[PDB]
């Protein structure tokens, strides 16, 4: 799925309001990217499907902290 691994951003739905207010169901999709993060504590690259906000969260916290959340929740990589 187009689900981020850190933030958990799955796709959501909304309307595509036109200038005449015609609502047609559309999807907002996360800015997902498969990025390869270096783990110095493991000395290896771990690939994740993270959004850009997921990347910013990993960069604010540590990659070890985010991987800890993944592992505690039940994620794989």
């Amino acid at each position: 799925s187009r689900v981020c691994q850190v933030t958990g951003k799955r796709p959501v739905t909304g309307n595509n309001r036109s200038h005449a207010l015609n609502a047609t169901k559309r999807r907002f999709l996360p800015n997902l990217h498969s990025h390869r993060f270096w783990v110095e504590s493991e000395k290896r690259f771990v690939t994740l499907r993270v959004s850009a906000k997921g990347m910013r969260v990993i960069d604010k916290k540590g990659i070890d902290t985010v991987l800890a959340e993944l592992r505690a929740r039940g994620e794989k990589y």
Partner: protein, 149 residues
Amino acid sequence: MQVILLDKVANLGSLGDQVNVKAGYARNFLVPQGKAVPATKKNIEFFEARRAELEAKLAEVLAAANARAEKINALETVTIASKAGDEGKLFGSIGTRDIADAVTAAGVEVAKSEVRLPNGVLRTTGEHEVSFQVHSEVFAKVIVNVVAE
């Protein structure tokens, strides 16, 4: 990123600077190597207090055996014998991997990415001047001769 540096970076570091780099730069080049770390609070404590001076001596041990050029005049002229044709113009190149595995002593002693070339790879059976960089500050001018096989 506010990143504290652990090495003299060519244009933006002084081995202890807390400089503001671009997040993608710090993410894909520095932190994946040992060149920098995030300078928020805890790594600032660790570097600037604990081992700001111990890492200096570790980097000096690393700069040793590197400042050991000792192979730009190893003996001299590591000469490679490849299957070349007449009129020079050796068909296939003698790669940097072949250069390294012929120049160290007998191959498995060094890596591949120390070899620099102002000519590309190889186009002639003759005399060529290859450079090395075992450290970022290394004036290595190894000399290579080509032999037909």
